């Protein structure tokens, strides 16, 4: 029933993610991120190409810190599934994630590189897409960070490319 109800709510949540009111978009992004933490509702989000497109679009245009963390966090969760990596890939997720590599918000930064690593690992076409978006230069720029786990994931992205 969790999956069926998340499924019905999706079109309205997709609509509110594209709203002009920034408080409406933030609240919808908080909602969708919460839905992405439960496997039944994460399944429903991955099956909606329109919903994944709205999370990508919102993530790359938002100036709201919580909105950026919630939307990148949502993509991070969906990237742990094959039917999730594919939806991110088709919705223009790679260029948006590459832009997020320039975030001063460290959780957005960690979510962005982990999702991109999951993509470079199992998504066909992700290698060339990361390169076309300038991800090679962006990832090299991060090698100056000091967190051990973050540096290793970033170095494996470059070792994969
Ligand atoms: C949310 N956001 C947009 C922008 C920003 C605006 C206002 C406050 C902060 C903080 N802290 C950051 O900075 C970014 C730059 C590049 C990629 C992504 C971000 C990003 O994460």
Residue numbers in the entry: 144 to 304
Give the authors' words.
In the canonical WNT pathway, the armadillo repeat protein β‐catenin serves as the central signaling molecule, linking WNT ligand mediated pathway activation to target gene induction in the nucleus. Upon nuclear translocation, β‐catenin interacts with transcription factors of the TCF/LEF family to induce WNT target gene expression via recruitment of transcriptional co‐activators, such as CBP and BCL9. Here, we report the fragment‐based discovery of a small molecule binder to β‐catenin, including the structural elucidation of the binding mode by X‐ray crystallography.
The consecutive NMR K d titration revealed that eutomer 6 exhibits improved affinity (NMR; K d=915±303 μM, Table 1, Figure 2c and 2 d) whereas distomer 7 did not show any CSPs at a concentration of 500 μM. The ligand was found to bind to a solvent‐exposed pocket in a loop region between armadillo repeats 2 (residues 205–210) and 3 (residues 243–251). Thereby, the carbonyl moiety of compound 6 forms a hydrogen bond to the hydroxyl group of Ser246. The meta‐cyano‐phenyl substituent orients orthogonal to the ligand's bicyclic core, binding to a hydrophobic area involving Val208 and Val248. The binding site is located between armadillo repeats two and three, adjacent to the BCL9 and TCF4 binding sites.
